[model samples]
Target chain A: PALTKSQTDRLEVLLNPKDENSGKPFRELESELLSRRKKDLQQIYAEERENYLGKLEREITRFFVDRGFLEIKSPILIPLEYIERMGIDNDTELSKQIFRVDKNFCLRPMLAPNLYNYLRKLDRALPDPIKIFEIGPCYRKESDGKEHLEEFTMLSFIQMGSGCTRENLESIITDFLNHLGIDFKIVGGDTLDVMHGDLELSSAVVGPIPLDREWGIDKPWIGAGFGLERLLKVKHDFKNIKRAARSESYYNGISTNL
Target chain B: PALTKSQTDRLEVLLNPKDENSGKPFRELESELLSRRKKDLQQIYAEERENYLGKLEREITRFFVDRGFLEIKSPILIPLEYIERMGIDNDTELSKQIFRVDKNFCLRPMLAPNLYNYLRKLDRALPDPIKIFEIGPCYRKESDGKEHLEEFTMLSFIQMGSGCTRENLESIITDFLNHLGIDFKIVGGDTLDVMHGDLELSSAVVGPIPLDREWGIDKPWIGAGFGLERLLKVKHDFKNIKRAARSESYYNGISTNL
Candidate 1:
């Protein structure tokens, strides 16, 4: 039994009040309504994400480059020996976290090993005051939670030679936050954690330089690392880390609405 | 043995031709030479690479951003089922290359699966003509060679909806090459390969089309993928791909003297 025009209009309004043809007959507005409904939540999320992440990445990349840091890309699959050199390969927890691609190869758990691999050698041929950074994914094996994941995007930066200090490190962190218009507090200790309330947006340490000795470097240095997803989650006040993570559940840091 | 000034000067000249202190006594020059030589092959490579890849990435990123293409990053580690969706899972050879993190997860071999996964749903949500891209690492298992690498950087892009055609695709490729000032030729085929002489720098396809149907996308689209190392290799004429790879062998796309 087909519905009368008046009943159909009432049902259409209940389903889509924004429909411009609110009181119109069904067939007249049916095709347009279907097309409008086709617009999915994932698409809306991605579009919104462009405003958040796209701008953030470009701005941050420029921020580092303009500050004289040379950006470098390191391999995701690295030799197991490189991990071992950091003295973490033998550690039970870290060793288990490494995702082995082959007998000799494994996914990089951190950027420090590779950055140090280059820095130790670069310290030889290059002048003093070498600064370098890498932004990419680092894999880990951990219990699932808001602050932890199997894989996450990381930005690790190292400064070699002279002029590295706690103050210098603090200045960099402060400047980065200031540029982004984010208010941050520095939680001080053996290592510094850049904080926005309870969340640690980034973490850093200045060496008395024990790690440098392993790499055969004599100069003082400082290093810092940040998790991009955590930063976004904290910034946007997302309830779950997955909202800022790469997943089937979200796109562009928004729920898929599936 | 303690050497005479003339002999010592001659020895220094032979070992350090670039030294300005030629014909000088050994003791004063010796300490400086040791300090100068401390700058390693990796450092020199990075300094040289600053001109090529470091600059190239920054510039290329700007090129895309300026053109209104939204840049988004996807997860490096992906679900095993996502890889299977591309129809490569059962293939014996490609299957073995996948780097598994655990029982259900593996490193993404390509960005296409994740991009398409979001795209199919996004296409339903958004209006026609969406442009998106990602720049990151893609993993593979290959023998040691000039062209193959276990982990390499990849830049992939996709354009969805109407107005996608061979001409639009060709124009976009041409514009990218033009911005880079790289001379490229289009080799005709079922898909287009942007070539720099014999080396294929990028491959692209425009579809109405068959692949889209598999992805549950009904609209026309175009997609392209490129190896950043290959682009640098062809641009610089590097003999071995390792020179442009992320390894102990290369730093910033230059051979490490180490």
Candidate 2:
């Protein structure tokens, strides 16, 4: 749905801090421009979508922390040799878009590999049941769109230690999401086990069962991977922000809450 | 100010996913490139910046966690080895601009010289109270805007044990902007602290302050270096986050009830 001119004008007013009501400076406009260009939030929140995403992030991150996850910080640049050694296809369109420094250097494309590194920290000294979470910007190659961009934020939680099985994790995640009030179905799997969904996307080899339509090309994980925008989007019941921030110039009736 | 004509259209959703009233694809303007270009958000969100900064790295790292120090990751490329290292009148500028892989390797320009290799780690084993901090993402030849383009995040901290004194750390920082947020201000000494109060800018230094600000400047005690982005920024904020995630810009406001 194309946005009506009036809606665009309204958004311009709302996001523009310089508006009489908001009081943003013109010098800061350059900062906002660079910010909007580098991030995908500008697209999704064409109207007020940011509110929803922002609220969602806040609540979700808190949930992880409450569960005793130590937040870990890592780097974005990665050694190129690791990428090549992993046999990642550099020819892929995604690889081409990464900000490159040396042949051995590229923006870290994700975190699982590094989680292993974090877990091994002080190998024998650190305690068990290490729960760690990290949220940060990740880069990739992508054309701009409603839910697409080369750079985006990511939220991840890792649990390290023995005696923790897939079922245990699945239950924790499911219950956690349920507590947040997102009505999501299990989709395909009937078992209690939950796989790290992102892993499936990067793996070239197929999983045990054939991939489902939703799980394949149209997986939500793709667009969903981008970081949350709008501070309101960081919380729950954020769908209301979308309605309030609605615009006719962009896709209408598209609610992430739904 | 409203977006310019060119910028306004940049994020406009021209291609409709499907007609809102009727489920029909808008064929003429449809180009799935935008959708196809999007990378897996789950994966992007999962990316770890540690390896890129080479901070969380341990392959060559020593044990520094027992002390107050963890690790420091800096830039892989640099322009000047030392004060005498600038090769040309425009040495710093030219070094940062030379991006050819063959001629330059952005393989950590400031670890060993900064004492990040194993000193901070071993600080814990030291009998005296020690304050330790490590700087990373240092490069010698690449100058982007600041005499160097090859960038890396820095991690610097203080540790105090048996004999370590608060005054010792103060001397180390040279009564510089110890706690002032986001601007450079030196608190002590005849020499003014060049890099004082900027959250993101490199803290410029001069004199014999135990810091090597250039590349190839021979320093025997220095071992390794790495980088950490927002986390390091945040570290500078509230002391530090050991293996913490890169902090959001609004983190200060959020974390401290500011």
Candidate 3:
């Protein structure tokens, strides 16, 4: 049965659900949208998420670089051994999420293994307060919800020196968040998390943690990883987390509806 | 004198013209956004372009993959000699644009040399139409205006086999464009150009042309390259191309206005 004008409008709001159109009966909204074309499932091309992410990426890079950080563009398709070095054994649940290209290689799930290798090598070469960062894609077979994605970009930065204090870690984190103009709070833990409202945006640690031994690093350091998508999703009021990801259904942040 | 509400409304239109704001005497709108802080240059988070481009990329990848096109992820960082192998001498104008990372390596300015090497090796290994594509970031110190970018993404696909033709080339291009739901006109000489209105989005060629010899590839082939950013820019009425690009100021297609 064709939906009337109000029904269609109600269906549109239910489909987009920007906290609106949610009140209509679920069965009715679902039945109507199911009958509609795939493209009609979404209305309005809001590429806002993608656009802001690019800017967020830029500001993050700018923030780190301005504070004496070196940006590293590492290989996204990395050797399988790098994953092992980061402490994910072949039998682990984490291994299943990794997109393997061949027997010997897999798409990196996180930037740390590569960063660890660089830090190990560069620590010997570069000066103290060795600040470096990488911003790029990572793959994981996550049980995705509003806060997770199988493929997303991560901003992983690490600083190592004799001055690697929790205070130093918190200060940089505070300054960087302030630069991005988000009011964030340091939530509880050994690996401290940054939260925007209820959403966890990033995680940080002052280490010599167990993972450090995998790379043969004994030095004190501070490291943090931020999910760029979650940061974007939380910053804006995205009804769906997929809207904040590298998606075919959404561009920048707009639903293709197609 | 302070601008009146009607004029402020007019100024808002002028700044974000989606074609609505362009007619206002430029000097007036410029002064307002200029005086109003960088964040006010654009309003409303319309991350439409970023969302669309990601979808466009996914669709393009799906179209080719479903049609038996093998996607290859090649190294973005390459040895300098590879550039020289493509007949770009160290002193050439093109060489000046290449981002050198060290004495022997630079960020690749184009996908050809890498693709050429893959073709040379894979041609010996894979079946005919040895159809392959690579979509990733390519760097060149381009003189960016509305149509160019210093760092941008490119989708380069090539088919080489016993049968390759101008007709075959056009059919594949047409199929891909049609799949994306974009109406494109074939405008060209030996190298056919795909245009969306006044914007040139992609270029193609049926080759056993001159460039193949560089990597020892001698075979009839059809190759096409699309500027993803330009494609997004042209499909939508973007007031500024930067909004449609992989940029810090804009992401997914929204102005960070930061």
Candidate 4:
């Protein structure tokens, strides 16, 4: 229930340090670290993320290659006008979240949109059922929460004439998850059915699928999203790693040492 | 070569706007992107880096699972000083290239340091030669070039314990390259031979081994560094794409909208 003497002293140092950056007290860093599970716990999260990604690279890439999917790298910077073309209300959450460089450029928020755009421009010589996948970072705007981060990784895939319909896509997803030893039950219907009256309903509210589709590329695509931080918290079974390192004074101690 | 009207227009749009927070123009962004391809490609050297990593992940993780390497996901955000003690090099050429939050927060630059720190915390019960590999983005501060970027992917592995030796490490590296059908040569050298005449380089180095008894951690510890971008360029032999795209646009007053 109590911090060790060293821990308390460290916190004291972090909160009120002799050295401050821009007149901001050391406690600002400490609070952020504590709430974000950021400090030492962040290290734990990164190693696990790396490990997961390594396994993912092997499993996912092999799956595509075995099935004769051609891996392609698309541009990360794209015109922002494309966002409006995708039926996204550019003035709303979509525009706000984007790391826009003027009206013409932005850090890609989703691989699906870019992949779709590429496919549309691809030579007709390529075959149908063009299975594709990409795992890389995407940017966003956040307001201080565990689930939301400005920068995060996204793993996306598409089956173009993979000869599999949407139903098969779900099965493929299920099998893929099962292969990774992740357990889940398949349920149909919309979010309201799943929520089972526990949630307030509005017919206008769509499922999370669209909001996550940041780029709005012209192709029809489906994606599975997971938070690196949240996944680590569950898989590693850690307590408060996000909060501690992200809190204040955490960096004061570090910077002081530096 | 001068850009065509349409190309110049698009480029201007992408390059002239200023970022709101930094009050910096888009030229910096373009410069960063272009410089990455030219000078800093080693960090992410497209062809070699990605392929080296792609193969390593496929082989190493499969090695671990086949040989009972416990698949563990470690926590990411923890205390601050814990990361420091892991010897991740807060002051390396790599660190200089990173995009970080306030002083306390960091994106992980390597997997080995985190993994070793995790293993240490686990009472080192991970069984000797704990076969593990991670593929993720590693950051550093450096000059950007044709095939490199400051933020590039790092494929890292840590075989815990004294049993993991230089010979075994070399074999793994060799096999990984072979499995991918990439040609590679191993150079034999002590500090003098490898360094030639650069004594300053010696002090700047960290343990290739995770611990004192370890070997093969740095003397070619990396199974491979796959350059994702260069691989694409080389695979397509697109030495002419840039020129062709330019000419087509300049003559026809046409630009294929990217």
Candidate 5:
């Protein structure tokens, strides 16, 4: 008898990054998959990988919170108007990718709009350097497979006013990345992105760009956004990005099916 | 001139808990609402209320973690089979109320199923009284107009093995509720619900029931789930439960539009 389609599909997910299961005997493959499931269910072997995501989130939250940065818990469902404010016009590639709930709102593809609102509202009221960070879920429709996830967490932060120069953006981010104990380098363009080998771990910009003023923010500002899964992906050398995601099929980096 | 339909609806949400905008001069209502928008955008007066929800979550997580409870970050997208295991059938009230992603999955309306898997897996591997807690969003589709929201955060905790009696359920809950500094009482049932005034803030049950044994757990267990919004709703006397929800329109109990 042949192994069932369900069993084959599950084996592909379970032994991810190691695809040598092809052409194996049905009984051997089936037995191997079943045995792994039994072992995984006995105790969480994904403990270390699973522990990093939340622990990093808590530590990052504390890092900023301890530094006089107000932690913002923004809404995941944002109005279309806010997306428009980000210059993501209708019919643009990014606009179509958003998870729409209706004509008026969608799951926020990024954290910038909500953070922009807070910056505009508090730019001057909170003194020279208005620092804030939001750590929460973000969604995008993509299938880059190894590196893309429809839903992922973000660590977005901004420093408006004093110390918002480009040099400081590198310095501050470097300071934080050093704390994570990961070697990283800055990649430059009109804006900068933080990179570790091939993966773009974070994107950042320093500004009072035209769009910033459009939102009524005039002071100099430096904002950077890091995909949380990307950080864990690089840190643990995860073969598939979904393994680091907030997923139903996987616990931490381990597939629950196995 | 009469207020535009949009303006009328805006007034209704902006002045929630107080419906005094009707029949007012359009200029007066418009001007009043505008003034509030300006004020709220100037600084966060929603500060304390916004603070509580996250703070409570952190505190609760800390409380349980301090006492050796492993925190489980379960996926919001859950397999429909798990819901069925909870005794919800197709065409049932809950089935219709669920936010389905597909035939196989829906946004989890409760955290029990995932926790149950953890309990069964960890039943004997960990010490007796394997405690775990998950705090995240739950979804339902309906409009009860008060005390109901399409999306709300839930704080769910479970303790299996030692001290699983109904008496300990109340005593342990009382010990935690005292930590919150809010008045609460336990309501009776085949299970128990924690109540404050008219609101059902938490639900609890104990077992080696037929369902427990079916899940391969034969140990005695007590599990209680709390609606974080309901706690905020009663603690602060929110007029509409949406004020306590993860809403794009409301920030900590304040309508963002104003």
Candidate 6:
């Protein structure tokens, strides 16, 4: 509702009163409005985030468990040699991004190397076509951006010798989305992307890539990596990824105002 | 299950033959018995640990949730100033022990500073008795020992001005342990240590201490800290903390024989 000139003046007076002792109040609804909206937004976001994350986790775990996938928890601090073997150390972009804890170790940036190491160590002991998944934190010293995070929850899964192909990857991810009732699409080079409008929620890649050879794994594999915060962003259409990130700023998915 | 000397010799030769053609025949149950026992123990331990951890998380979450406590997550990599404020940066033992991600940042060694920062920011806006909890990883560079770990899961909670006191601290922790059906004792000054034989599984401190002053949280508060791995160790009577820790050597508390 539009206000009359006199009404607007009255509202301005009610919102801001001039001090009698030689003080004139400046009309600053811009800052006040911005802050109020942020406070309200963060509270609602936190609640919605908690519910969404809980549901996403349950569905993903069930999907993998129902399909005979063994869920594993790996160390966040990994040997530097493993990163070197995975060739991440060779990439100029990733080389300095390593969160070094000491000379011997750094925080793991991905689940691939850890999973691959396990596969190499467990060779011939477990049944053929081993299926495994891990949901945990991965760290990288990335700069602040709408799509980047220094610490993020990651859900990575790999099926070794599952006879899965690039084509099968689509259906596998599609089936996962179907369970969550989230609509998605296949996009970019035989990859399955859980999408939100034009946004990519998560992606799965089918590979027998050179990196696998570095880990001494010769079998064909299909792997998927999902940033949990990215999924939350897509779920809520949030403009900033930090709203859904693990930070003291937000609780449950809402801003920590109170 | 007892085998004769000749049967043992046959079993040993069959199980550990230097040459393929040297000995191929041994209709003995000793080797099978030894393997079966190991397989049985590992399977049991793996299943037991999973159930234990899952229940522990659920109950702890429920305990706070029912109490109107808002659960939160803080960044694993906190600012160096927070470390310094917590006095860990000055402690000769913890000074060099920090897992420095960079000159300005390090993996948080305790949840107290982060929680206190949030408490300060939330001071006026929140109710007087603000209750909060966080369960996450804390890192330290320490020598290998039966009880020490480089990275470990920590569950820390604070109740600011909830009529907290030294006497109440014991009962609060007592109730927590009672919920788990575990035995504990308050063994120290203004601190309740949840003990499992000689092992300390958890501890709660009633504080208006100098450390609180460092973080600018002057209010009286009671806080509790629990090591998840230590809880698992006590629950399972495991000889080494590494078994319950996040390590490549163990999978679900069973030593991965790689």
Best by DockQ: 1
Evaluated against the true chain A, what TM-score does chain A of model 1 have? Answer: 0.77
TM-score of each: 0.77, 0.39, 0.48, 0.48, 0.76, 0.79
Evaluated on chain A only, model 5 obtains a TM-score of 0.84
**RMSD after CA superposition, every candidate:** 8.4, 23.3, 19.1, 15.0, 6.5, 8.2
lDDT of 5 by residue, B160-206 (tens): 88988888777768978887777898888258888888888888887
Q: Give me the displacement of residue B141 in model 6, in angstroms.
A: 1.5
Q: Report i-RMS for every model.
A: 4.9, 22.2, 16.6, 12.0, 5.9, 5.0
Instruction: Tell me the tens digit of each residue's lDDT in model 6 across B1-258.
Output: 455689755444323211122233334354454454345434543343232343465467667656655566678888888877776546568897887778898888888878897777666445567677777788887886889888888889788876878776666677777876667666782766767777777777887877777667878888899988887776665667877777666654554542
Candidate 1 CAPRI level: acceptable
Best by lDDT: 5
lDDT of 6 by residue, A1-258 (tens): 344577444333223111111132323433453355445434533343233443455457667767756667678888888777877655578888888777798888888888887776545445557677777788888876778888888888777786768766666777776776666676762456666776667778777776777778898888888888887776665567876777766544444543
DockQ of each candidate relative to the true complex = 0.31, 0.03, 0.02, 0.05, 0.17, 0.30
Candidate 1 chain A weakest ten by summed lDDT: A13-22
Q: List model 2 lDDT by residue over A136-206, tens digit each.
A: 54555556443343444456665555435545555565766567544333323222222222211111111
Candidate 3 residue lDDT tens string, B31-109: 6554443333211111111234444665676677677665555556667898887789867889778766537666678
Candidate number that wins on DockQ, 3 or 6: 6
User: Which sequence of candidate numbers ranks them by lDDT, best first?
Assistant: 5, 1, 6, 3, 4, 2
Question: Per-residue lDDT tens digits of candidate 4, residues A1-258?
Answer: 345577555554433222232444445645653433333333433244234433454565565555444444444445676566555575677667766643456666766566655445331223444455555566666775534546655555555543545455565656655565544444341321111122211111112345334533233433344333333333343332232222222221121211
For every model in order, the fraction of real contacts preserved is: 0.39, 0.03, 0.00, 0.03, 0.11, 0.30
Checking candidate 1 for backbone clashes, the offending pairs are A39-B125, A40-B125, A124-B38, A124-B39, A124-B40, A125-B39, A125-B40
Q: Candidate 1 on A57-130: residue-level lDDT in tens?
A: 55676677678676676676888887777788565689878788668888788888888877776665666688
| Local accuracy of candidate 1 as per-residue lDDT tens digits, B1-258 | 467778564444323323463555566565555555444333443444353444565566666666656566677788888777777756567887887766888777788887877777665566567777777777877765767777777888888877788898888889998877788999872588888877788889877656566777776788889888788777666656766776664564443332
Each candidate: chain B TM-score: 0.76, 0.24, 0.79, 0.50, 0.83, 0.77
Off by over 4 Å in 5: A1-50, A89-91, A102-104, A123-125, A213-219, A237-239, A247-258, B1-50, B102-105, B123-127, B209-219, B235-244, B247-258
Q: Order of all candidates by DockQ, from best down to worst?
A: 1, 6, 5, 4, 2, 3
Instruction: Kindly give the number of clashing pairs for every candidate.
Output: 7, 104, 27, 86, 0, 6
Predictions in order: chain A TM-score: 0.77, 0.52, 0.79, 0.58, 0.84, 0.75
